[PDB]
Amino acid sequence: IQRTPKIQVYSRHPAENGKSNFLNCYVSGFHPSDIEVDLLKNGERIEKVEHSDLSFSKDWSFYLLYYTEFTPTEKDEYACRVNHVTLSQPKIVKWDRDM
Amino acid sequence: KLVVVGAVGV
Amino acid sequence: SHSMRYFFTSVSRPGRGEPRFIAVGYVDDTQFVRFDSDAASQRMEPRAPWIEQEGPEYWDGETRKVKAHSQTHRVDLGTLRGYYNQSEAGSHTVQRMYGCDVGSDWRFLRGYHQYAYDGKDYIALKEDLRSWTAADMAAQTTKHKWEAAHVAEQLRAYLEGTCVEWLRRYLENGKETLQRTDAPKTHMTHHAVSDHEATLRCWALSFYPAEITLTWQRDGEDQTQDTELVETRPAGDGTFQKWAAVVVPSGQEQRYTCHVQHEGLPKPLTLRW
Ligand code: NA
Ligand code: NA
Numbered sequence: 376i377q378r379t380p381k382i383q384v385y386s387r388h389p390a391e392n393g394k395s396n397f398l399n400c401y402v403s404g405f406h407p408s409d410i411e412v413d414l415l416k417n418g419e420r421i422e423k424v425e426h427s428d429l430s431f432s433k434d435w436s437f438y439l440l441y442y443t444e445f446t447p448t449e450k451d452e453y454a455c456r457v458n459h460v461t462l463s464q465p466k467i468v469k470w471d472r473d474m
Numbered sequence: 475k476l477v478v479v480g481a482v483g484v
Numbered sequence: 485s486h487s488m489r490y491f492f493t494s495v496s497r498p499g500r501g502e503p504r505f506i507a508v509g510y511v512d513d514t515q516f517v518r519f520d521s522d523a524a525s526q527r528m529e530p531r532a533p534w535i536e537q538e539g540p541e542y543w544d545g546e547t548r549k550v551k552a553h554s555q556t557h558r559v560d561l562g563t564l565r566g567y568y569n570q571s572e573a574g575s576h577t578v579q580r581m582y583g584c585d586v587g588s589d590w591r592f593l594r595g596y597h598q599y600a601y602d603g604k605d606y607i608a609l610k611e612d613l614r615s616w617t618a619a620d621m622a623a624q625t626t627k628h629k630w631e632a633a634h635v636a637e638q639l640r641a642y643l644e645g646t647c648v649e650w651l652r653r654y655l656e657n658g659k660e661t662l663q664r665t666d667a668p669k670t671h672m673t674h675h676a677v678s679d680h681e682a683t684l685r686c687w688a689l690s691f692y693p694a695e696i697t698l699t700w701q702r703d704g705e706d707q708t709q710d711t712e713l714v715e716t717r718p719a720g721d722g723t724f725q726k727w728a729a730v731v732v733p734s735g736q737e738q739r740y741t742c743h744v745q746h747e748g749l750p751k752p753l754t755l756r757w
Contacts, residue, residue, distance in 0.1 A: 408495055
């Protein structure tokens, strides 16, 4: 009855240090729809984060895109933190630069 | 354009 | 082919107040309208430039209809709690999807109207648009009600009429984007994973529509072993992304080809390192 979210963390454009970009957290395949998604900069919640309107797939599982403008640097670490009824603790997925 | 006829309840 | 689809989600709030209701409209893989019960406007809102040209009668009409949809879902959450003998204490979800496809001939191809309760099939209109698939005895009760109320006849009239006519209107008004294919921008990357092995990753970026096939071949035969294929994902600018990777012996990269199939490609692309 409950399906756990799949998580992808990626940039809209090829990541280049000092070039403005968009950080994406795509959460899919989850049920029910209530979900907490935060984008993290060096472990700290980013404020200006927007998300797509709730929609769902043929199997009725939900998907959302969470996103923020960001400028990648050599030092700064980005991640997506997801909480859902199917998770005993919030799941943190690190942004892998070329994934 | 959405369905115009009122939706029938389950 | 082209599609118009509406998606509705209603989630009950047992602690206080009425269900959260979210409606979204799509043409193909492009969102064009939304309603969110939690938003300030309490209106159907545009989400594509080509729907903004619709006049006030359109926005008033779609707002009236989507609010009526929200009240139907609110009532249905109550009815379904009854059918399944569930307490008032739990949150539950109703989902509805309906819409229509036009084919290569720009004529009606197929219609659909599907309902789910708590993420499981409940009742669905069959492809003939004349019969219902009821998953269980709660849905069988609904089927008997909808047969008596001639719901399939009402939906058939919409799906073969209004639905395809307005899909064709939207496709013309939005043709600059809706009838433009964006072929995937493809490249391969190479990363050593050991002294003896390398990962080849085949990228498909900035494509529209979302439907794509990435396949690896070794010496001209399909290979699935030692491969990874990520779910197609939105870029956030209306286009999509996907990649497929294969682990290969270092020095043997030339044996491997990535094959990309997409509506925007006259012939499939072959990439080689
Ligand atoms: Na890469
Ligand atoms: Na690679």
